[PDB]
Design a protein around this ligand. Structure first.
Ligand code: CLA
Ligand code: CLA
Ligand code: CLA
Ligand code: CLA
Ligand code: CLA
Ligand code: CLA
Ligand code: CLA
Ligand code: CLA
Ligand code: CLA
Ligand SMILES: CC1=C(C/C=C(\C)CCC[C@H](C)CCC[C@H](C)CCCC(C)C)C(=O)c2ccccc2C1=O
Ligand code: SF4
Ligand code: SF4
Lengths: 742, 69, 73, 80, 151, 139, 42, 104
């Protein structure tokens, strides 16, 4: 039983004394401010626990309790989302008419004329239209009343209180020892089996006993207050067997392995529900039940306390071949002694999963009536692309913090890390060449087209009409997925998504999903994507690989992860740190994700979204202009940015005037950021000197001597306002555009 | 839909076979622990029969799928 | 690009390009007379300023002339 | 090469000499400060211009001053 | 077994001995290429490289150039290749002027005379190889299309 | 005094971070040091190497690379026995550091002060005063 | 009341957040009871 | 390129390390070790009642009959070809790992 619970009791005293002493956590900051730099250095380094403490135990304790604090905030956030749905929303009116009522769960106070924001969202209601997709979640959950939304809100508040108690309790009363945190086999067994496996299984149970009966009655057309309460399905097994006759047999088919009996509610239909335009919830129930089984199975792989299981160290040390030296030896020690190495992996994977979520949810719309709510489809795609891109760049941020700090060459001799660092010139030169090739052969095709169209030579352009760059591999994969039902997925009845080909699914005369054809414009913008992702990898990988040393600076690890430069010598070493590649790679992430959401927005409006009428033909939002106009930059400028900015500019005096104001406000913040990005600290300190002089003249100089921001903080402030401004402009542009027309 | 059959002694036979198959396999391949009377305990027995109900359930469903039953 | 990204990032890339040229067969037959280096700190400010300024002029001149021509009013 | 100067305000703390990454600086005997020593710049052809010496210097205005000048292979820190 | 080692027994040189870099297959190809093959004058090295490069140059200009849909497509493509070859020869000449001091050695590529020899061979071979491709494309209808004559 | 070219080199598997053609045609730097152990250190140019017990020898392209290794070898392995050489392609080996047997941060007799200015930094001459004149701004 | 908790509430960010929330709050209230004051009424 | 046999030529995978690529034995065993299981038939429209190797081997000949014409996008040749080679490359990779490394 070497996997055991070990706790120090009453480690840290619950006292308000350190609250009154800002900066108590570091030796530099605890002696108080003398310049204004102290104030900024206080906020900058506060959650950098491994910069304050030497011991991995105290660092692990601070992290565990801070994760409870984060959970408490998320539960509070969720509880408020339910309460605004319960109290300030048109949810009940939306349940009766999901295709007519626009979801709204935010009402403004009348103060300075701002009550114009309470627009007519429908259902005898005035409020701010919400695009987070909660209404579609709640109907998928089977909520059907505001009373149940109040109970969910209380359930979030109780959980929110319990997490903040646990964070206090596990830091101040019962803090686990380092040997508790260093149980990677136990944690993985429980997080696969217990968290993910029982998470899916329990949710499958809710889906089967609550979501499936309630949503069958809704899609049959029964009024929400005419629907039995969710526990009457749990007790009256006769009533549940009316909707799904397999329930007449109970749990004998489950235990005797006669699973085919359960095909009423555990289907493999594929495609969409014609009534709601969403995934069949009988499929999602089977999906979560099947996922639950193999998460519970996966969580029995590793060895804890009984000899059965794998040692993760043994798996890693055995995988070594003739190209890779000692192989994965020493990686277990890295990943059970470095939190940053763990955070680097988990941020890159969570960011990747968030990017996948964006693609899977628009193409295979999971919730009822979310596919034809186009403001939600655009909002949750754009939101989850940004979460993914940010989290991916923090994976390289913390891979750099690992390499600078937690990397020890003595324990990493001739293994995979040692070998990567020892040919990093070959990696970075090959990536650099790919990015030049990719930029020339993706963006240069656009420049070729701008010139040819401007020169009157439309026969010389790369277009469907002219020279054709077809995406044959993507078209071929689309062919296979339409052929899969009955052929390579024989028991499936419909395709995984109608985006691959097949029918047009219409709900309330609006397209839910329909085949997303790929042409020359799709070939061009996909290689635009591969170029922007590869350059982002190039900037971030070069920062991780050269974080400790270069040919330029032989001792970059002694300067740290985050330093501004090593002087104007060697020609100039401005922005040479690993932090400065995260800084430069967040711009190229911003560039990458901006083109992705622009590609998504224009393609869905031009080729997918719109209205169906007689003869079954579809009138799209921008009328199919993507194919012949997304091949030039002038087409993107004119037919996408200029044409679709009309709604946000003409929004003044409407309920969308808030988006019009945020459009201008974010344009401001973006431009203001360039003051911090294009300027240097030395100018601003000398300007402050004259301002200090005028204060000295009036005897009003401060005792905390004002300083210009650090070189790094000028970069961090410039990047933050650039991101706030750039993303905030697109947020207003996307939301005012798609609320008006979709 | 893949045909499955109500529990019969044939279903039992496959399950029994699979459980025993894994009990013998577990005596051979479990690396950390009288062919079955050395070092055999409950976590070894509870693991081999857990894989038997995984292998047996898969075998039963597959043999029902193809017609062997 | 010249105003936001500064020298240290670019000098370290250029060192990986110098390595690759020397190690690539049939290409290391050709040698630079001047060692390739990243632009200086002051020079990049001047290059970015020129590009910023040139882009500013060409955009407005294209706008002020074409919008007036197109409208005639 | 770069030009590195030491002014007679040097308190002989040796910090510039310890911070120099290229062994440009050394300590010579003096009698103008309490420490009996002053910084010296005998090997400025090896100065890369990092100005780590200037950062290390604690006198109010720097006793050691680097003046960036003509660039060489050594002062451009080129390993190629 | 280990496939990666230091380059030519030297652990501190800026290169590695990898299978792409130093396999028997790689060594063979490099040693037998005209630039590195033994027993070749620099002029002959230029001719073989020139014939190779000039021959393939004709095709992209012919198939994708401005006059591609005209009946003067092959003429325009050859002259476009000839113009590139002439521009490239100027590049070769100026490289020799600025890169090599004048010495009697002429059997090496990296000499003033040896580069001038190689440049002479490359221009003759490039025009020769481009001319050969012109003759073949002019006469054979398979090459004029992409093989599309068969369908 | 002179570099014994036969000193064994630390066990290293190679890297792309080592020296290039400019080392074999312009100048190369070498560092030697004594190790009491057969222990792993970090190369300035890349990954990790193992220094052999006894005398080690490396070759690097930059003088700063040899001293960055010297700093690390003295801060984590307490080796103060390091000698840095400059090597020209003519075969000439030029001893560099420590230049007179004593470290620069320690005073030594017979060191002549170079670069020393008799006044403080504020007493320099204005640029206008020395315009079209060869006179130096340091007084 | 605890003196260390009162010393915490006297910290610059809390007072800045409280004072400017209080300041913002009586501008908001003044514009509720007395709205649309483009001019000093005279 | 070229194939090296199990018997000792002077071929070196890198600068100084000779290494016997077992291109006859690995390629033969990987081919047979992938083709024979792949003979397993399936009454699926892509296979057509044959196995993956045999439906694929059938689709080489049908498209070879129309020799100048390429197979179409919806033609089963491409899917069969991709799946067959994916398993074949994997068995070749795993076969080279198994034979060269474990030597038995
Ligand atoms: C977590 C997410 C969240 C978010 C973003 C919102 C957002 C909003 N809510 Mg909702 N709400 C939430 C959770 C949330 N709520 C929860 C969990 C509940 C259940 C209790 C409610 C219950 C609720 C009601 C009942 C109402 C709102 C209302 C509102 C709106 C105005 C709030 C306002 O100005 O009051 C401002 C109130 C103040 C007292 C001002 C306080 C300002 C202080 C100075 C902030 C300082 C914080 C402090 C310094 C932190 C440090 C502590 C200190 C010791 C140093 C706004 C849209 C109102 C609305 O929609 O009206 C139409 C409304 O009536 N909310
Ligand atoms: C079955 C066991 C189990 C489960 C469910 C969890 C669950 C969790 N652990 Mg893990 N953990 C476990 C065992 C388990 N742990 C063991 C054995 C160890 C020791 C090796 C650890 C060590 C560990 C560390 C070091 C950390 C976690 C963290 C977390 C949280 C991850 C963030 C997240 O997704 O939360 C959101 C998802 C939720 C579902 C929220 C649920 C909140 C409760 C606690 C879940 C369980 C409730 C209860 C069992 C359900 C009752 C059902 C009943 C109604 C029928 C999550 C609550 C991290 C964290 O955030 O710390 C707080 C973290 O840093 N765990
Ligand atoms: C700043 C972070 C942030 C914020 C504010 C949001 C906000 C939102 N998300 Mg997103 N999300 C994020 C990060 C974020 N997301 C990340 C990082 C992921 C990747 C794991 C996702 C994946 C995700 C999914 C898959 C869904 C949302 C949805 C939603 C919306 C409803 C919120 C809700 O009740 O969840 C409700 C969430 C659900 C009902 C289903 C969640 C199912 C997932 C698979 C649970 C996974 C939990 C597990 C512990 C995580 C493991 C991670 C893995 C790498 C190991 C809202 C717009 C929902 C939406 O768009 O509805 C319209 C939705 O279905 N989110
Ligand atoms: C953690 C998830 C969870 C939970 C708490 C429950 C809980 C329950 N299920 Mg559900 N169920 C689940 C997942 C879950 N189920 C899943 C994943 C499936 C798919 C295999 C089912 C399929 C299922 C069926 C088909 C039936 C239940 C039934 C029941 C009830 C058990 C009554 C009983 O023993 O007699 C069961 C009857 C016998 C003859 C034995 C109970 C309310 C039964 C019930 O009461 O229906 C409402 C019932 O008939 N469940
Ligand atoms: C699970 C996620 C996670 C976690 C736990 C951490 C944790 C950490 N990171 Mg990492 N990071 C992450 C994600 C994460 N990061 C992501 C997604 C990125 C990409 C942007 C980074 C990029 C990154 C860098 C580049 C650095 C860190 C650093 C740090 C450490 C110091 C934190 C601190 O003191 O900041 C204190 C927190 C603040 C000062 C907050 C201010 C930040 C912004 C500007 C405010 C937020 C704006 C807001 C959302 C919108 C405002 C609305 C507007 C309209 C008003 C800590 C170890 C630093 C370090 O040195 O680590 C050793 C460091 O240099 N991280
Ligand atoms: C429009 C603005 C713009 C443009 C064109 C570039 C261009 C480039 N950046 Mg920069 N960058 C920018 C803004 C921009 N950046 C900004 C704002 C930042 C701030 C954070 C950066 C930060 C940044 C970093 C950190 C990195 C880059 C990289 C790159 C290169 C990508 C490789 C490539 O595509 O090669 C192809 C070249 C192009 C697409 C340029 C346009 C050429 C087109 C096709 C026309 C060519 C015409 C032709 C030459 C005319 C010849 C005749 C004429 C002379 C008369 C390329 C040189 C990366 C790099 O250098 O790695 C490879 C890299 O690491 N950039
Ligand atoms: C005698 C034993 C036996 C037999 C005849 C089968 C036969 C079958 N199994 Mg089963 N299986 C077995 C043992 C057996 N299995 C065991 C021991 C396990 C381990 C638990 C599994 C786990 C298993 C899973 C998890 C699944 C199957 C599935 C299948 C079927 C389709 C596989 C296919 O063509 O996908 C071809 C797909 C490709 C991607 C290949 C290209 C096939 C009839 C699958 C199925 O569809 O069942 C309905 C399925 O999901 N089997
Ligand atoms: C695809 C076919 C295949 C598979 C699965 C294996 C698998 C195995 N071989 Mg074999 N081998 C093969 C073809 C294959 N070999 C061929 C064609 C030859 C002749 C040239 C050999 C010759 C050979 C020898 C001489 C030896 C092995 C040995 C081994 C075992 C461990 C070493 C190894 O290769 O690691 C492979 C590791 C695994 C397969 C398990 C890891 C699990 C992951 C998921 C790998 C999956 C890879 C891939 C996706 C599976 C593809 C299957 C198919 C679709 C192509 C392992 C059971 C050794 C052994 O243990 O002796 C019995 C041994 O001595 N093999
Ligand atoms: C993800 C894991 C992974 C991958 C991708 C590889 C990939 C490779 N290994 Mg490695 N290897 C691995 C894991 C892996 N190995 C592990 C875990 C072990 C320990 C058991 C080994 C032990 C090992 C040995 C001992 C050898 C290899 C060899 C090879 C090569 C196979 C030959 C080939 O490409 O034929 C396929 C050819 C084609 C597809 C032609 C395409 C045209 C290839 C580079 C062999 C090699 O280098 O041969 C040259 C070799 O001798 N590996
Ligand atoms: C304007 C500017 C300054 C001057 C800006 C300073 C000194 C900060 C002024 C901030 C004031 C004092 C407080 C900020 C309050 C803001 C109104 C709200 C900020 C939001 C959070 C900080 C709360 C620099 O110091 C600088 C340094 C390096 C590169 C570029 C620049 C730069 O561009
Ligand atoms: S001080 Fe500023 S300009 Fe000078 S090197 Fe550092 S970052 Fe560059
Ligand atoms: S600038 Fe750098 S190299 Fe030059 S003397 Fe100062 S510290 Fe030494």
């Amino acid at each position: 039983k070497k996997v055991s619970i070990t706790v120090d009791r009453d480690p840290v005293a619950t006292s308000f004394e350190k609250w009154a002493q800002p900066g108590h956590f570091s030796r530099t900051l605890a002696k108080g401010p003398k310049t204004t730099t102290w104030i900024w250095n206080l906020h900058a380094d506060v959650h950098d626990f491994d910069s304050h403490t030497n011991s991995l135990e105290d660092i692990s304790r601070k992290i565990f309790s801070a994760h409870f604090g984060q959970l408490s905030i998320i539960f509070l956030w969720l509880s408020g989302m339910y309460f605004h749905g319960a109290r300030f929303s048109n949810y009940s009116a939306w349940l009766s008419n999901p295709t007519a009522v626009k979801p709204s769960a935010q009402v403004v106070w009348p103060i300075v004329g701002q009550e114009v924001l309470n627009g007519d969202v429908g259902g005898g209601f005035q409020g701010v239209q919400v695009t987070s997709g909660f209404f579609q979640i709640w109907r998928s959950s089977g909520i059907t009343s505001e009373v149940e939304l109040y109970w969910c809100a209380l359930a979030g508040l109780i959980m929110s209180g319990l997490m903040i108690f646990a964070g206090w309790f596990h830091y101040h009363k019962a803090a686990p020892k380092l040997e508790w945190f260093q149980n990677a086999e136990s944690m993985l067994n429980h997080h696969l089996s217990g968290l993910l496996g029982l998470g899916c299984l329990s949710w499958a149970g809710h889906q089967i006993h609550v979501s499936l009966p309630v949503n069958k009655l809704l899609d049959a057309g029964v009024a929400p207050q005419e629907i039995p309460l969710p526990h009457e399905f749990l007790v009256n097994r006769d009533l549940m067997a009316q909707l799904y006759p397999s329930f007449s047999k109970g749990l004998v088919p489950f235990f005797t392995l006669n699973w085919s009996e359960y095909s009423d509610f555990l289907t493999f239909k594929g495609g969409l529900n014609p009534v709601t335009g969403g995934l069949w919830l009988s499929d999602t129930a089977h999906h979560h039940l099947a996922l639950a089984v193999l998460f519970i199975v996966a969580g029995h792989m590793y060895r804890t306390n009984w000899g059965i299981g794998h040692s993760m160290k043994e798996i890693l040390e055995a995988h070594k071949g003739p190209f890779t030296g000692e192989g994965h030896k020493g990686l277990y020690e890295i990943l059970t002694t470095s939190w940053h190495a763990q955070l680097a992996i988990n941020l890159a994977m969570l960011g990747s999963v968030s990017i996948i979520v964006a693609h899977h949810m628009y193409a295979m719309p999971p919730y009822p009536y979310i596919a034809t709510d186009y403001p939600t489809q655009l909002s949750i795609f754009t939101h989850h692309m940004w979460i993914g891109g940010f989290c991916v760049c923090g994976g390289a941020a913390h891979a750099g913090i690992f390499m600078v700090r937690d990397y020890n060459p003595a324990q990493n001799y001739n293994n995979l890390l040692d070998r990567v660092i020892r040919h990093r010139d070959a990696i970075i030169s090959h990536l650099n060449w790919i990015c030049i090739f990719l930029g020339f052969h993706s963006f240069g095709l656009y420049i070729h087209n701008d010139t040819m169209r401007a020169l009157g030579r439309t026969q010389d352009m790369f277009s469907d009409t002219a020279i054709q760059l077809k995406p044959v591999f993507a078209q071929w994969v689309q062919s296979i997925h339409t052929l899969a039902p009955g052929n390579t997925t024989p028991n499936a009845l419909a395709t995984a998504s109608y985006a691959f080909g097949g029918d047009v699914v219409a709900v309330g005369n609006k397209v839910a999903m329909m085949p997303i054809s790929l042409g020359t414009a799709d070939f061009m913008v996909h290689h635009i994507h591969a170029f922007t992702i590869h350059v982002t990898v190039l900037i971030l990988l070069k920062g991780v690989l050269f974080s400790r040393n270069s040919r330029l600076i032989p001792d970059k690890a002694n300067l740290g992860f985050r330093f501004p430069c090593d002087g104007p010598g060697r020609g100039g070493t401005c922005q040479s740190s690993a932090w400065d590649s995260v800084f430069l790679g967040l711009f190229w992430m911003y560039n990458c994700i901006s083109v992705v959401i622009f590609h998504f927005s224009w393609k869905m409006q031009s080729d997918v979204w719109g209205t169906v009428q007689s003869d079954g033909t579809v009138t799209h939002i921008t009328g199919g202009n993507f194919a012949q106009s997304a091949i030039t930059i002038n087409g993107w400028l004119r037919d996408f940015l200029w044409a679709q900015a009309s709604q946000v500019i003409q929004s003044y005096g409407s309920a969308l005037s808030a988006y019009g104001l945020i459009f201008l406000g974010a344009h401001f913040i973006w431009a203001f950021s360039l003051m911090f990005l294009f300027s240097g600290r030395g100018y601003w300190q000398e300007l402050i000197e004259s301002i200090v002089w005028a204060h000295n003249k009036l005897n009003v100089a401060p005792a905390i001597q004002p300083r210009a921001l650090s070189i790094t903080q000028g970069r961090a402030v410039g990047l933050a306002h650039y991101l706030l401004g750039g993303i905030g402009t697109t947020w207003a542009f996307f939301l005012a555009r798609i609320i008006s027309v979709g | 839909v893949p045909q499955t059959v109500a529990w019969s002694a044939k279903t039992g036979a496959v399950m029994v076979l699979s459980n025993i198959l894994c009990i013998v396999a577990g005596r051979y391949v479990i690396q950390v622990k009288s062919g079955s009377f050395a070092g055999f305990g409950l976590p070894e027995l509870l693991a081999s029969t857990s894989l038997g109900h995984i292998v047996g359930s898969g075998a039963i469903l597959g043999l029902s799928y193809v017609g062997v039953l | 690009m010249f105003l936001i990204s500064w020298r240290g990032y670019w000098q370290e890339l250029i060192e990986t390009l110098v390595w690759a040229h020397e190690r690539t067969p049939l290409a290391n037959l050709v040698r630079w007379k001047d060692k390739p280096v990243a632009l200086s700190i002051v020079q990049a400010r001047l290059v970015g300023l020129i590009h910023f300024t040139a882009g500013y002029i060409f955009t407005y001149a294209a706008f002020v002339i074409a919008s007036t021509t197109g409208k005639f009013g | 090469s770069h030009s590195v100067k030491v002014y007679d305000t040097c308190i002989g703390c040796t910090q510039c000499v310890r911070a120099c990454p290229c062994d440009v600086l050394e300590m010579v005997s003096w009698d103008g400060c309490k420490a009996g020593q002053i910084a010296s710049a005998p090997r400025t052809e090896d100065c890369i211009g990092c100005k780590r010496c200037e950062t290390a210097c604690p006198t109010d205005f720097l006793s050691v001053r680097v003046y960036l000048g003509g660039e060489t292979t050594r002062s451009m820190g080129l390993a190629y | 077994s280990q496939f990666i080692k230091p380059y030519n027994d030297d652990p501190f040189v800026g290169n590695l001995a990898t299978p792409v870099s130093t396999s028997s297959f790689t060594k063979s190809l490099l040693s037998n290429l005209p630039a590195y093959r033994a027993g070749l004058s620099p002029l002959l090295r230029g001719v073989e490289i020139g014939l190779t490069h000039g021959y393939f140059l004709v095709g992209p200009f012919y198939k994708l150039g401005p006059l591609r849909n005209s009946d003067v497509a092959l003429l325009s493509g050859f002259f476009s290749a000839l113009g590139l070859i002439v521009i490239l020869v100027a590049c070769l000449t100026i490289y020799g002027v600025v890169s090599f001091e004048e010495t009697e050695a002429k059997d090496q590529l990296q000499t003033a005379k040896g580069w001038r020899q190689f440049t002479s061979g490359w221009l003759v071979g490039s025009v020769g190889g481009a001319s050969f491709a012109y003759i073949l494309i002019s006469n054979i209808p398979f090459l004029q299309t992409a093989g599309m004559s068969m369908l | 005094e002179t570099l014994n070219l036969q000193i064994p080199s630390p066990t290293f598997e190679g890297s792309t971070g080592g020296w290039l053609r400019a080392a074999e045609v312009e100048e190369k730097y070498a560092i030697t040091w004594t190790s009491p152990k057969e222990q792993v250190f970090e190369m300035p140019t890349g990954g990790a190497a193992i220094m052999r017990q006894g005398e080690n020898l490396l070759y690097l392209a930059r003088k700063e690379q040899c001293l960055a290794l010297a700093t690390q070898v003295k801060n984590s392995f307490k080796i103060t026995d390091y000698k840095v050489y400059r090597i020209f392609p003519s075969g000439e080996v030029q001893y560099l550091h420590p230049k007179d047997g004593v470290f620069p941060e320690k005073v030594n007799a017979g060191r002549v002060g170079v670069g020393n200015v008799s006044h403080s930094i504020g007493k320099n001459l204005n640029p206008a005063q020395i315009k079209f004149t060869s006179k130096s701004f340091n007084g | 009341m605890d003196s260390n908790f009162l010393k915490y509430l006297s910290t610059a960010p809390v007072l800045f957040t409280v004072w400017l929330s209080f300041t913002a709050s009586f501008i908001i209230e003044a514009n509720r009871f007395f709205p649309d004051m483009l001019y000093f009424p005279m | 390129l070229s194939v090296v046999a199990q018997s000792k030529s002077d071929f070196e995978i890198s600068d100084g390390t000779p290494y016997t690529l077992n291109v006859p034995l690995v390629g033969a065993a990987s081919f047979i070790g992938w083709v024979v299981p792949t003979l397993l038939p399936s009454q699926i429209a892509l296979y057509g009642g044959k196995g993956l190797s045999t439906a694929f081997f059938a689709s080489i000949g049908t498209n070879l009959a129309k020799f100048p014409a390429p197979p179409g996008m919806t033609d089963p040749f491409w899917l069969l070809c991709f799946i067959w080679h994916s398993g074949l490359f994997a068995t070749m990779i795993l076969g080279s790992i198994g034979y060269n490394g474990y030597a038995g």
